Design a protein around this ligand. Sequence first.
Ligand SMILES: [K+]
Length: 173
Amino acid sequence: MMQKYIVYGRRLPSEKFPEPEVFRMTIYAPNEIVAKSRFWYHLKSLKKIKRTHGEILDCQHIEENGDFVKNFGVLLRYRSRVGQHNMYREVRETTSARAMDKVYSEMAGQCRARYHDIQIINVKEVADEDVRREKVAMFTQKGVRFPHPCPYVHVKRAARTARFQDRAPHVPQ
RNA sequence: AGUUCGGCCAUCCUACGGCGGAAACUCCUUAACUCGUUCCGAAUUAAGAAGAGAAGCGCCGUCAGGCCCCGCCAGUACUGCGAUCGGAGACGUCGUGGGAACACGGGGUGCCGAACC
Ligand SMILES: [K+]
């Protein structure tokens, strides 16, 4: 559901400063209306330009090619009930937006932090040798094999319409 | 440049060093008359022209105190509207608007209007 957007903005031009500077950002958001709001949240803190005093020049939407599985490293900050913290996370996904979906669900589940509690500092691709987290690194290898981690899930699902049967089914492994 | 009468009432004030005076303003000289000092010609009232740039006044100066403008401080402190956001609470968070002060660093240091020499 996440999407990559590039936003340009600038302070409204005046007599003291004709041709103000242009600032660009990369944003991940579910749509164009949330993305432009998040651009004004940062430009107000980092550059002290409220939304009343500036204008947005573009909301570029960028669609990425998948088809191969890469590593990503996300540097972010979030807020808990006792303060603010920094954190680095690693994930394997096919596009950057999909890697941000995975991050937001792990923050929501293990830290209970929602979307507006989180500021993304950095998102970059990480080559296989340079990985630093054990979970990701296991799969950055040649020849990884494991048996199915939950084959019971197949059997139960079929038993939701086939409510009564004549023998208890097996779980092939 | 100067004197009398004013407007706005320190970018004009206060302190200490300087520099100036043809004219002008001042300081200054006098106790007959006028009038005056809880005592005193100090002040003030009258009458004058020997002397002055020592003061006041105008100008210049000072890592000067004050005062005045700008930037920073800072989209920080605080706050209007909305929330079946978090927390035992005290309190905090997010969305959408408004937005300081102290401190700090650089600059500056009266102008306008009538009449006369
Ligand atoms: K003098």
